[PDB]
Amino acid sequence: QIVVGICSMAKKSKSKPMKEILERISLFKYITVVVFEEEVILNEPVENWPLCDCLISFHSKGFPLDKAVAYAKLRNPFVINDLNMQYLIQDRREVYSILQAEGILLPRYAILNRDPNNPKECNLIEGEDHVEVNGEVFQKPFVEKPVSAEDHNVYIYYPTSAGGGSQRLFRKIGSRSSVYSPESNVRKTGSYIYEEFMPTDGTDVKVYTVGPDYAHAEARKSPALDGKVERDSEGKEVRYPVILNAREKLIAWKVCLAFKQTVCGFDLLRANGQSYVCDVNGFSFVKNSMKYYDDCAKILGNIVMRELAPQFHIPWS
Numbered sequence: 001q002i003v004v005g006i007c008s009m010a011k012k013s014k015s016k017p018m019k020e021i022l023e024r025i026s027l028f029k030y031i032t033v034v035v036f037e038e039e040v041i042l043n044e045p046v047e048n049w050p051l052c053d054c055l056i057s058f059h060s061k062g063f064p065l066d067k068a069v070a071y072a073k074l075r076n077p078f079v080i081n082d083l084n085m086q087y088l089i090q091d092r093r094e095v096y097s098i099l100q101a102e103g104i105l106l107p108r109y110a111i112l113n114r115d116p117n118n119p120k121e122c123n124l125i126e127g128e129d130h131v132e133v134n135g136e137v138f139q140k141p142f143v144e145k146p147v148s149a150e151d152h153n154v155y156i157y158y159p160t161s162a163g164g165g166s167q168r169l170f171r172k173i174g175s176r177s178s179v180y181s182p183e184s185n186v187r188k189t190g191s192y193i194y195e196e197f198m199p200t201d202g203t204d205v206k207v208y209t210v211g212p213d214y215a216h217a218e219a220r221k222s223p224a225l226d227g228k229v230e231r232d233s234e235g236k237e238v239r240y241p242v243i244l245n246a247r248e249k250l251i252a253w254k255v256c257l258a259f260k261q262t263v264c265g266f267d268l269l270r271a272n273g274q275s276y277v278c279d280v281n282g283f284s285f286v287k288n289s290m291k292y293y294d295d296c297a298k299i300l301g302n303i304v305m306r307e308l309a310p311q312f313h314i315p316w317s
């Protein structure tokens with residue numbers, strides 16, 4: 001049997017999307033799925049972790065990535081989502097830097113790094129209707145993101161012509177994803193990426209790859225629009241159908257390969273006749289789509305089989 005190891009926090013390992021997918025991967029005749037217990041992940045040295053031939057593992061809050069890396073180094077499994085890239089995925093500066101290098105369209109941006117030691121020694125000048133970040137001008141509206149990709153406190157600053165003030169996004173709480181603030185001045189402590197605001201039709205397109213040749217997309221109301229979450233009958237955020245164009249499929253292919261995340265979530269902004277990548281989140285499943293559960297499990301199982309069947313002497317075509 002080929003052993004597929006699943007190594008992530010229990011929150012993720014026991015989520016419905018995960019359970020739906022693992023159950024289908026298990027229908028592969030030569031595959032056995034082992035889900036590492038959270039207790040073992042956090043408290044046992046890697047030497048005691050289960051063996052696997054293929055490792056599916058990803059960082060979310062609380063996950064000891066260092067131990068996942070050390071485990072993979074010890075056992076040398078076939079790695080579905082590269083572990084070291086997951087340090088970089090946590091850092092918007094590194095994410096954006098990879099996108100530029102791969103020739104992927106993204107918003108014009110500039111990084112403001114504030115060294116925690118110095119009192120006031122940053123490269124930032126603020127006007128009423130713009131900022132200058134290391135000399136680079138951004139007219140409002142512009143977007144201000146914490147350099148930590150796990151920090152979802154993204155601010156949008158409105159131009160005086162639109163009434164000034166700001167929109168503060170956050171991790172969804174109930175009916176809301178953002179709120180208006182009369183505050184017009186940028187945040188004064190911490191490091192941030194500043195970027196041009198890309199005018200979309202008020203939705204974000206969310207893309208989910210499973211390998212570089214398969215990508216499901218769907219749209220959701222932009223959190224910055226007014227902050228009210230559209231919910232269905234069952235209190236799940238309303239999603240709208242999307243079909244990617246040729247440019248966007250190529251984008252999905254590049255993102256999946258550039259970050260070495262077979263399973264990969266990222267966000268597109270359809271603006272000005274193009275599509276811009278504004279966020280790459282790594283390992284991420286589509287929810288509430290039976291067909292995605294089927295495709296994803298099938299693709300992953302196929303990848304596993306293609307990769308490992310020869311050394312296991314299993315016929316596979």
Ligand SMILES: O=C(CP(=O)(O)O)O[C@@H]1[C@@H](OP(=O)(O)O)[C@H](OC(=O)CP(=O)(O)O)[C@H](OP(=O)(O)O)[C@H](OP(=O)(O)O)[C@H]1OP(=O)(O)O
Nearest residue numbers: 011012060061172206235236237265266281283284285287
């Ligand atoms: O928002 C919620 C609560 P709800 O899903 O409304 O019950 O869960 C988010 C999940 O949202 P959705 O796709 O709408 O279900 C969030 O997912 C999204 O927002 C969609 P995407 O993953 O960003 O494409 C996201 O889930 P995944 O990363 O597991 O997908 C969040 O996980 P986190 O980032 O906090 O670890 C997860 O929060 P939590 O359940 O508190 O951990």
Ligand SMILES: Nc1ncnc2c1ncn2[C@@H]1O[C@H](COP(=O)(O)OP(=O)(O)O)[C@@H](O)[C@H]1O
Nearest residue numbers: 107143152154196197198204222223267278279
């Ligand atoms: N450059 C931009 N122009 C216009 N809207 C943006 C831009 N960047 C982000 N947004 C909006 O803000 C939301 C959150 O920003 P994102 O980069 O996805 O951060 P997070 O990692 O918290 O999701 C996006 O879903 C999108 O609606």
Ligand SMILES: [Mg+2]
Nearest residue numbers: 026028029031
């Ligand atoms: Mg099986």
Ligand SMILES: [Mg+2]
Nearest residue numbers: 267278279281
């Ligand atoms: Mg996002």
Ligand SMILES: [Mg+2]
Nearest residue numbers: 149279280281
């Ligand atoms: Mg993100």
